[PDB]
């Protein structure tokens, strides 16, 4: 196409369009030429960067400081051959519909900002580093589809330019920036308004599919109001990022011949389990840090304190953290019923210093009043919505509910939100930060003594600010209900909203002893496939029917994710009937299906490392119950070989028979939207022994 087909009937022109999907969007379009030749800085994808950038002093930083429109996009989309598109899509809420041209004008003020800013060399060097490392360390791909993709490159690019396609910035082009600025003009605008409620209102009609839209242009007063208001107030450009990763020359594995996370350092405050990389030799280093506090279980008020504190807290430094999010180097902050959690992920270069900034800012943190109140009301409405959630989701809430020493309820959470004031937690934060605990976990292509200095530096800064004094070891105490071990217990809690009924029967075996591990796993999976045979497939009671294990508190368990509106005792008798089914069916399972199924559990267990993240997640599970058994793989496999057909019958009749003395039977009913009974939850935890605790590591 030697001409632009957007032929002057569509510039500065509205199109209020009814979609088919229940969607709300807005496109702004620019026909820009085939600058595929102009890949030196690639100004269209540079605008995908810059227009995509949502950082300090940003446009979207202001409009989410104004709260109207949540997200957006603007960048180079390929149109036809000879020209290309530049599609500017945004999120739509209902409130932005009255503010549309003002948002457009916000767009225009950011355009005029970067027009007054002109070109930026530091963006070129930074994003050139980004492209060089990203295409340097792009990991792998599915083969099929990738080949046709780079074959699509192979037309536009020769046989040495299909990998190096847009993946290196050669020379900075301020005047191509000025060219697309001449493309990016208010005169150059298609407007595509998307709203479903204009049915019976839209008349101008698409040819093939037959959908209807409108022209309905913008008068020149608002056009010129876009034109004349090329001024600059609140909006500011970002600065250079403080960090780039440059250490990628990998450091070889030294004298430490252990293949595991090793506890190399333990003080009154610090405890450093530490590992170096031997598998994949990748320059990322992923970090894991728990923030234990006794202040965790204090109140539902202190729950929301810690919760909403971490919530706004991670939200607040995210305003700082857009360069890191833009770096693709991620992290995590997450709460625990024991406290908080910290993760830091990405490359091992400048994680300590950036992390020190994170630590310093969360330590020395200022508090806004009203912004917080909006957050407070938002989670208030969230908890209001929480009563209308699914019975299987609430069944997992029962899993966290009846399986502890103590918890708080959502009604307790409900009245206490009235009790929230900001100086309360604002004074409680130095109450909080004077005593809590950080255990250290480090893993990557990282040395030992440098990591010691980094961790010591960070905790030294911590003691420098708020003087976090250590705990007692009994002050790291842990939260489970003693059974009569044969009696079956249940209560019902009728739903408010969802008409489906929830049910599950639980069975704690024990701790994760190698005995009870293969007991639970093999018994659960050996009933899983006959359940898939008959109860799910044959009976078809409801779709949400599932069986699984429980693994929490260092304590095993048995679950049955079943949600369906049935009579209670009726579905109880059905689950009992499947218990009888497996009672005979296991005795019916001969040695062949036995061996194939234990091989299935083996290959379930047998999987090589894939990243640091998956192994580190399993490592984190090793951490939280303090067990660290990094070689229970082969051990539990060799134990699995010890199980016979008679051996599992020994596992049946002691614990799983109808008259078994270890019948760990308990249920919780959930009714619709409309043995003996349990009187009170106070009665549920009133008269009880408790358990021996697991030997730690």
């Amino acid at each position, epitope marked *: 196409f030697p001409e632009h087909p957007f032929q002057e009937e569509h510039l500065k022109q509205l199109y209020k369009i009814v979609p088919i999907k229940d969607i709300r969007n807005l496109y702004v379009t620019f026909p820009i030429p085939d600058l595929q030749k102009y890949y030196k800085s690639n100004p269209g994808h540079y605008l995908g960067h810059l227009i995509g950038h949502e950082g300090p002093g940003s446009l979207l930083s202001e409009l989410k400081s104004k709260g109207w429109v949540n997200t957006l996009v603007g960048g180079q989309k390929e149109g036809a051959r000879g020209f290309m598109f530049f599609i500017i899509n945004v999120d739509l809420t209902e409130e932005g519909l*009255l503010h549309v041209e003002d948002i457009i004008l916000h767009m225009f003020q950011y355009i005029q900002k970067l027009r007054a800013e002109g070109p930026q060399e530091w963006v070129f060097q930074e994003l050139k580093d980004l492209n060089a490392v990203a295409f340097r360390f792009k990991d792998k791909e599915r083969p099929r589809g990738y080949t046709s993709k780079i074959a699509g490159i192979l037309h536009y690019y020769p046989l040495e330019e299909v990998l190096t396609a847009e993946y290196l910035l050669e020379e900075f082009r301020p005047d191509l920036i000025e060219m697309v600025l001449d493309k990016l003009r208010p005169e150059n605008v298609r407007v595509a*308004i998307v709203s479903k409620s204009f049915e019976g209102k839209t008349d101008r009609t698409e040819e093939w599919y037959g959908t209807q839209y409108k022209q309905e242009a913008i008068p020149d007063e608002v056009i010129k109001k876009w034109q004349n208001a090329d001024l600059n107030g609140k909006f500011k450009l970002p600065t250079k990022n403080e960090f780039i990763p440059t250490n990628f020359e990998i450091l070889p594995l030294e004298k430490e011949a252990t293949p595991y996370p090793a506890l190399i350092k333990d003080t009154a405050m610090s405890k450093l389990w530490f590992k170096q990389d031997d598998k994949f030799f990748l320059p990322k280093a992923n970090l894991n840090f728990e923030f234990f506090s006794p202040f965790a279980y204090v109140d539902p008020l202190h729950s929301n304190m810690a919760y909403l504190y971490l919530e706004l807290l991670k939200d607040s430094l995210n305003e700082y953290a857009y360069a890191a999010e833009l770096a693709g180097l991620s992290y995590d902050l997450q709460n625990t019923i024991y406290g908080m959690y910290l993760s830091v992920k990405g490359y091992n270069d400048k994680q300590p210093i950036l992390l020190k900034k994170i630590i310093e800012k969360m330590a020395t943190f200022e508090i806004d009043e009203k912004r917080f109140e909006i957050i407070k009301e938002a989670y208030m409405r969230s908890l209001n919505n929480f009563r209308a959630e699914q019975p299987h989701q609430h069944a997992m809430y029962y899993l966290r509910l009846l399986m502890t020493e103590v918890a708080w309820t959502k009604d307790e959470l409900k009245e206490a939100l009235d009790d929230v004031t900001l100086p309360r937690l604002k004074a409680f934060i130095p109450q909080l930060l004077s005593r809590l605990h950080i255990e250290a976990l480090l893993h990557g292509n990282i040395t030992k003594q440098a990591a010691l200095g980094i961790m010591q530096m960070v905790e030294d800064t911590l003691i420098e600010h708020a003087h976090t004094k250590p705990l007692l070891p009994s002050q790291l105490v842990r939260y489970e209900v003693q059974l009569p071990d044969r009696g079956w217990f249940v209560y019902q809690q009728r739903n408010e909203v969802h008409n489906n009924s929830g049910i599950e029967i639980y069975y704690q075996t024990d701790m994760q002893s190698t005995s009870e591990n293969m007991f639970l796993e093999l018994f659960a999976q050996i009933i899983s496939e006959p359940a898939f045979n008959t109860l799910r497939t044959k009976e078809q009671l409801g779709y949400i029917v599932f069986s699984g294990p429980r693994r929490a508190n260092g304590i095993q368990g048995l679950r049955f994710i079943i949600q369906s509106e049935k009579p209670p005792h009726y579905l109880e008798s059905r689950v009992e009937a499947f218990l009888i089914t497996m009672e005979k069916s296991i005795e019916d399972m001969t040695e062949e299906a036995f061996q194939k199924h234990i091989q299935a559990l083996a290959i379930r267990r047998l999987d090589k490392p894939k990243k640091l993240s998956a192994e580190s997640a399993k490592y984190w599970g090793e951490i939280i119950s303090q067990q660290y058994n990094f070689d229970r793989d082969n051990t539990e496999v060799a134990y699995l070989k010890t199980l016979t057909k008679e051996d599992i019958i020994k596992f049946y009749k002691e614990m799983l028979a109808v008259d078994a003395p270890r019948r760990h039977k308990v249920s919780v009913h959930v009714l619709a939207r409309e043995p003996e009974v349990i009187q009170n939850m106070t009665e549920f935890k009133r008269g009880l022994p408790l358990f021996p605790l697991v030997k730690p590591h």
Partner: antibody
Amino acid sequence: EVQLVESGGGLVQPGGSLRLSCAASGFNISSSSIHWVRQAPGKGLEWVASIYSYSGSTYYADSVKGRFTISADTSKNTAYLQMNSLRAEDTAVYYCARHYSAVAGLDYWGQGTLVTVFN
Amino acid sequence: DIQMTQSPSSLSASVGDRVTITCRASQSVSSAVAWYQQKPGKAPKLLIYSASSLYSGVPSRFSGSRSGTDYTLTISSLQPEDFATYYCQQSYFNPITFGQGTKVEIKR
């Protein structure tokens, strides 16, 4: 040329509500829009309201933000304003006055109706 | 939002007098300011759009001027029909302020 025939501004109560109907004839409200002006007798000027019938963008002052609902039948180029929660200090001549395509140009006017919020 | 102060609020000046009327802007305002006449008991007018540009039907005896931020209307000469309450405008998506009143009286 540009005809601003206001109507509908009549009788209301303190706390009351109305609906305007301004026959903005002779031009396009698809073109440069009319707006709404407070002027209580013996008092100065305040902007009331703004319909963008080509785009649906409603605008109000901060005390009256949200508690109105403005509309305009732009096929007829006929403006409306559902007035709501009308309090007694708002007894004011509300001008259906056209803003033309200028940077600040509001040149055409109605005579304005004294929507009276009397007792 | 940004307020506007029409200085002077009132005046007395005979037919044929050159009158400077300055709407005082609160902040840095671009060319987003009109100028208004209201004859009392009548619907108002626009005197000057674009802070300097005369509208059709309004005579040449009214010469607006973009004057820094506190923009200034300069009536070049008064008439017996010019004895009217005057105003201005501030046109943004900000809440639009106006004149604070300026009625021309006579000297006698």
